[PDB]
Amino acid sequence: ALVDVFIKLDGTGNLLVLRTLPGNAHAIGVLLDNLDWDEIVGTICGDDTCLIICRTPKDAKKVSNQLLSML
Amino acid sequence: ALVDVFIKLDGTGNLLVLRTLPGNAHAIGVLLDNLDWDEIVGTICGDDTCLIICRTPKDAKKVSNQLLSML
Amino acid sequence: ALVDVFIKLDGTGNLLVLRTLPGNAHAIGVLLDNLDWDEIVGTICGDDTCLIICRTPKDAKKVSNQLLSML
Amino acid sequence: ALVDVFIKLDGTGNLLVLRTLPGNAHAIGVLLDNLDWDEIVGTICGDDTCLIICRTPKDAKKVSNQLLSML
Amino acid sequence: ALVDVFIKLDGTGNLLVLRTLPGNAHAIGVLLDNLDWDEIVGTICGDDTCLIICRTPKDAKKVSNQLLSML
Amino acid sequence: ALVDVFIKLDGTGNLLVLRTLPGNAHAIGVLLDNLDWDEIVGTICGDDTCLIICRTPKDAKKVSNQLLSML
Numbered sequence A, B, C, D, E, F: 001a002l003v004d005v006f007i008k009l010d011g012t013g014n015l016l017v018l019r020t021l022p023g024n025a026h027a028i029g030v031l032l033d034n035l036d037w038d039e040i041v042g043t044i045c046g047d048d049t050c051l052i053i054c055r056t057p058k059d060a061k062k063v064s065n066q067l068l069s070m071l
Ligand SMILES: NC(=[NH2+])NCCC[C@H](N)C(=O)O
Pocket: A025, A045, A046, A047, A048, A049, A050, C022, C023, C047, E026, E027, E029, E030, E033, E043, E044, E045, E046
């Protein structure tokens, strides 16, 4: 249901910062962790932000593309 | 929204305990706080549980019915 | 400190619901727990709401008074 | 592993307040939710406090006894 | 506000790690997110630590400077 | 302690991602912060993931080895 709470997807190097509606970070964090993509080392969620730690910037770009493709 | 994460709605006296999918408590906590129902004194969310503190058991029954009606 | 984030103090029976600025519930929760008032059985904080569980409605009124006196 | 993080168990009416070591509330919240005791309506965890909402004070006393028996 | 809870500001590359008083991470996280500085890609808060993800190490030094200037 | 909730330890560069049982991230976050290892700049915990920000990938390898040695 990413499109229902997704707000913005930014990034730097091997890191992606996914911004969601208030209080929905952990909901997508659950989604992300359940994908278990090899490119994602791990995810950490606060209240409206999800930090996706990827192996490399290239894996980040890849994850970013697959994520935006779900909207 | 609610129907997509709702799992169970229980209660005792003036208290309602809303159970949601893992990591979705704060998402509905935002929904509940946004409704600003006079019956709801306040809400506190953990990871998958939302505690809705109502003024009286009567107000709780009322809130429970309006909540279930959105399912 | 409290006056800097305090927004509203409500209650029912032996329960008090303290509303704070977004993300400041746990800051006050720390304050409350550090007071160790005999009247307060315990505190549970979400994002902007603090549930203060008091022993009796009378202890709740007492706690409410002391809290508002710090504003 | 309750005994490893348990600090104190208090209560009022149908409510129980379980105090744990810092950051361990959700760990026991998981334990409590997995028990699915009929007496427990629900649980809400903060950082070091777990609020156990029981149906009645009698169910609270019962839950309290079973919990302390695990230490 | 920041000076009231600020404890330490560290960093590595494009990342800044802001340490605050216990339970005050999200309070500052709200402050940071409200500044919407172009240098900050995003923020993630735990209990007493705020991770500020900046675009580059240079933007991190900049953000660090502006932050410490508010003390 | 750690062995009782530890699930996986991954990493990239100066970052380590520790995965724990659901709801146990902050319990080990407390453990990590209590160690005050010079290698660890800081830690941020969500629900089941702990992000350990180390100064360099070398420090991360070091921290990773001492962590796994406690298993
Ligand atoms: N209502 C709040 N807690 N706001 C602060 C959010 C801080 C940070 N963006 C996070 O998601 O962790």
